Design a protein around this ligand. Structure first.
Ligand SMILES: [Cu+2]
Ligand SMILES: [Cu+2]
Ligand SMILES: [Cu+2]
Ligand SMILES: [Cu+2]
Ligand SMILES: [Cu+2]
Lengths: 277, 78
């Protein structure tokens, strides 16, 4: 139940995380996560029903989605937890994240194909099945479509925003949620998807295992935001068309609300997370 | 109010757009006759399912960004 910075995992932890991910893929369970995410990405709209992103529920929805995935990993190896990628600290292609004993590196230039690591197509262990681009190999172009990952100073500027979210509760919103998501402002989470490239830049972005580490860090930043703003809370708080209000249930589960997910410590803690100061 | 339709060959591929499990979309794009899911954002920018996190100004720009992403590969239908 502790989520750790990827940069700090032991060799044993990396091995067990990798092997649990590959077993979820082998058994067919992994690709349904990819498929669920793509369905929300394609359906959520700024002027219609919106649940998994471009909306206040972006954060609790991804928190529950990552919990579902972590629980599946634990069903294979109960010692495994989701690591997080602090892309503000580990910001080059040199990071140990991208080493062949962890996620493998960038894609070669011709066709974006990842050539090393346990998820390289040549292993036979990571077929890309749920897809729009018809190619079936993992692709990346680290730093290709956008020069730099966000910095600590830019993350701090978003963490400083006091309102969780603001009407119209979509990609045009001011407020914390939309600045972290990235549709407005210096852009944190969307830019990271663009920076990895390959499937991470598409609606089938959980095809890349870095998806989970990226979102685990996004989730950590929500927790840091809550510590900075103990007086601010999820909005809206009732009767908002097309938006998940605080105590409304969320698809696809239907049995959980944003209110049930605001406090992560009910499910996990972080290796380090500051107290409100 | 819908963008204009278009039809061109871009980096050897036919891209078309027209006003019309995924949202109810007012505009359709095609890459070599296969429909590409695209979406308009509140600020009027567009994205597509193969470049979802990087808004571009128009549906034609999204179709072109999709051809760039595909590097010659056929698109699969959504
Ligand atoms: Cu997402
Ligand atoms: Cu801003
Ligand atoms: Cu994302
Ligand atoms: Cu205080
Ligand atoms: Cu649609």
């Amino acid at each position: 139940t502790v989520r750790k910075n990827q940069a700090t995992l032991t060799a044993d932890e990396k091995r067990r995380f990798v092997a649990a991910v590959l077993e979820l893929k082998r058994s067919g369970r992994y690709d349904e996560f990819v498929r669920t995410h793509n369905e929300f990405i394609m359906s959520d709209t700024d002027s219609g029903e919106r649940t998994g992103h471009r909306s206040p529920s972006f954060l609790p929805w991804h928190r529950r989605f990552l919990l579902d995935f972590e629980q599946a990993l634990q069903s294979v190896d109960s010692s495994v937890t989701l690591p997080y990628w602090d892309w503000s600290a580990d910001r080059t292609v040199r990071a140990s994240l991208w080493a062949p004993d962890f996620l493998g590196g960038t894609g070669r230039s011709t066709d974006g194909r990842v050539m090393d690591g346990p998820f390289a197509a040549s292993t036979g262990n990571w077929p890309i099945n749920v897809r729009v681009d018809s190619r079936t190999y993992l692709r990346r172009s680290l730093g290709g479509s956008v020069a730099e990952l966000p910095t600590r100073a830019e993350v701090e500027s978003v963490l400083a925003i006091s309102a969780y979210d603001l009407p119209p509760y979509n990609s045009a919103s001011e407020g914390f949620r939309n600045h972290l998501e990235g549709w407005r402002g210096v852009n944190l989470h969307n830019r990271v998807h663009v920076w990895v490239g390959g499937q991470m830049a598409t609606g089938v972005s959980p095809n890349d295992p870095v998806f989970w580490l990226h979102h685990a860090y996004v989730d950590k930043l929500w927790a840091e935001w809550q510590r900075r703003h103990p007086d601010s809370a999820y909005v809206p708080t009732g009767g908002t068309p097309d938006v998940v209000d605080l105590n409304e249930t969320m698809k696809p589960w239907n049995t959980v609300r944003p209110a049930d997910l605001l406090d992560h410590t009910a499910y996990y803690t972080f290796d380090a997370l500051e107290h409100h100061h | 109010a819908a963008p204009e339709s278009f039809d061109e060959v871009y980096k050897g591929r036919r891209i078309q757009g027209r006003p019309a499990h995924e949202h109810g979309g007012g505009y359709e794009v095609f890459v070599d006759g296969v429909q590409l899911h695209v979406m308009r954002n509140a600020d009027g920018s567009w994205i597509s399912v193969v470049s979802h996190y990087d808004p571009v100004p128009t549906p034609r720009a999204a179709a072109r960004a999709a051809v760039d992403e595909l590097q010659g590969a056929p698109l699969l239908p959504f």
